Design an enzyme around this catalytic site. Structure first.
Site, PDB file in Angstrom:
ATOM      1  N   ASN A  32      -6.118   4.273 -11.944  1.00  0.00           N
ATOM      2  CA  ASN A  32      -5.800   2.837 -11.808  1.00  0.00           C
ATOM      3  C   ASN A  32      -6.631   1.271 -11.567  1.00  0.00           C
ATOM      4  OD1 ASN A  32      -4.897   5.443  -9.526  1.00  0.00           O
ATOM      5  ND2 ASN A  32      -3.954   4.709 -11.258  1.00  0.00           N
ATOM      6  N   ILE A  89      -6.825  -4.135 -10.189  1.00  0.00           N
ATOM      7  CA  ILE A  89      -6.740  -2.556  -9.301  1.00  0.00           C
ATOM      8  C   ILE A  89      -4.823  -2.819  -9.599  1.00  0.00           C
ATOM      9  CG2 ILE A  89      -6.607  -1.743  -7.059  1.00  0.00           C
ATOM     10  CD1 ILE A  89      -9.391  -3.401  -6.951  1.00  0.00           C
ATOM     11  N   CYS A  90      -4.708  -1.642 -10.062  1.00  0.00           N
ATOM     12  CA  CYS A  90      -2.982  -1.057  -9.936  1.00  0.00           C
ATOM     13  C   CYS A  90      -2.686  -0.385  -8.402  1.00  0.00           C
ATOM     14  CB  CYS A  90      -2.298  -0.162 -10.469  1.00  0.00           C
ATOM     15  SG  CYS A  90      -1.995  -1.123 -12.045  1.00  0.00           S
ATOM     16  N   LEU A  91      -2.577  -1.294  -7.483  1.00  0.00           N
ATOM     17  CA  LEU A  91      -2.050  -0.709  -6.112  1.00  0.00           C
ATOM     18  C   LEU A  91      -0.934  -1.860  -5.366  1.00  0.00           C
ATOM     19  CD1 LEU A  91      -3.111   1.004  -4.030  1.00  0.00           C
ATOM     20  CD2 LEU A  91      -4.889  -0.991  -3.014  1.00  0.00           C
TER      21      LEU A  91
END
Lengths: 149, 140
Positions: A78, A85-87
């Site tokens: 991620n 950042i994949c959040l």
């Protein structure tokens, strides 16, 4: 003439009551820019490593999400090759009720529990799904190479 | 006056480069997709019609240093070109001779520099310069 009270508040509380395992310090020129170091979480393949992150509070904060990126190379489904950042709370699910601290906590937790199942996970996700042992060892290798100094 | 830090500005430019702008006659992107410092970019300019640059793809190297975008990027043509302001032996763009660089503002961007160079290719003093053979590149 200066910063909104909320930013003064969050900045000052960050330096007075830091998140365990996270250092967060102001930039010497830009009062909306912060230099963060996150320790690899206990029992993760990032443990023992220190990871640089940068955080920026855009003009419209807190209506707009804070911007965050890793500046240390990390092997994780991620976090991409440029540290993005994949959040969900950095995009879809941001709201003014959330704060900087929630973000840093969420990022620490992401290192503790990577999610290769995320639709938007990078090309490292396949390895994490099909040969998790090897992927974890590679994450440790990259911790040794990039996150120990 | 809220300044966007270098790295976050460059991430914005990365996304814009991927989306493309206008008619696609200029484009830009990271030279190395693993470059976390976001320093080295590739620029592309399609030579404009009815000039001696026409029907040529120009490749450039654009370097965004530690002070970008408060300071302008460094620019060099890889594709050989005869053009005022471009060193005709090395491809280096002389900032003092290109107005967007000489008069740089922090509102400018890689897009703006490439668009300016393309516009200058249409200038009376450039459009009729005889060119080196197509596809030739400088050394280094």
């Amino acid at each position: 003439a200066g910063l909104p009270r909320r930013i003064i508040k969050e900045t000052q509380r960050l330096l007075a009551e830091p998140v365990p395992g996270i250092k967060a310090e102001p930039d010497e020129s830009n009062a909306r820019y912060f230099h963060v170091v996150i320790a690899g979480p206990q029992d993760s393949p990032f443990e023992g490593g220190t990871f640089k992150l940068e955080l920026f509070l855009p003009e419209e904060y807190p209506m707009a999400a804070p911007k965050v990126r890793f500046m240390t190379k990390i092997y994780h489904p991620n976090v991409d090759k440029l540290g993005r950042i994949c959040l969900d709370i950095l995009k879809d699910k941001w709201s003014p009720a959330l704060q900087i601290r929630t973000v840093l906590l969420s990022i620490q937790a992401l290192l503790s529990a990577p999610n290769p199942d995320d639709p938007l996970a990078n090309d490292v996700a396949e390895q994490w799904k099909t040969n998790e042992a090897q992927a974890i060892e590679t994450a440790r290798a990259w911790t040794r190479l990039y996150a120990m100094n | 006056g809220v300044k966007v830090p270098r790295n976050f500005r460059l991430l914005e430019e990365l996304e814009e480069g991927q989306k493309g702008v206008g008619d696609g006659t200029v484009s830009w992107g990271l030279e190395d997709d693993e470059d976390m410092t976001l320093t080295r970019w590739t620029g592309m300019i399609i030579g404009p019609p009815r000039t001696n640059y026409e029907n040529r793809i120009y490749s450039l190297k654009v370097e965004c240093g530690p002070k970008y975008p408060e300071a302008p990027p460094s620019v060099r043509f890889v594709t050989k070109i005869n053009m005022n302001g471009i060193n005709n032996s090395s491809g280096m763009v002389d900032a003092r001779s290109i107005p967007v660089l000489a008069k740089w503002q922090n509102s400018y961007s890689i897009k703006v520099v490439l668009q300016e160079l393309r516009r200058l290719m249409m200038s009376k003093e450039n459009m009729k310069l005889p060119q080196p053979p197509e596809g030739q590149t400088y050394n280094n």
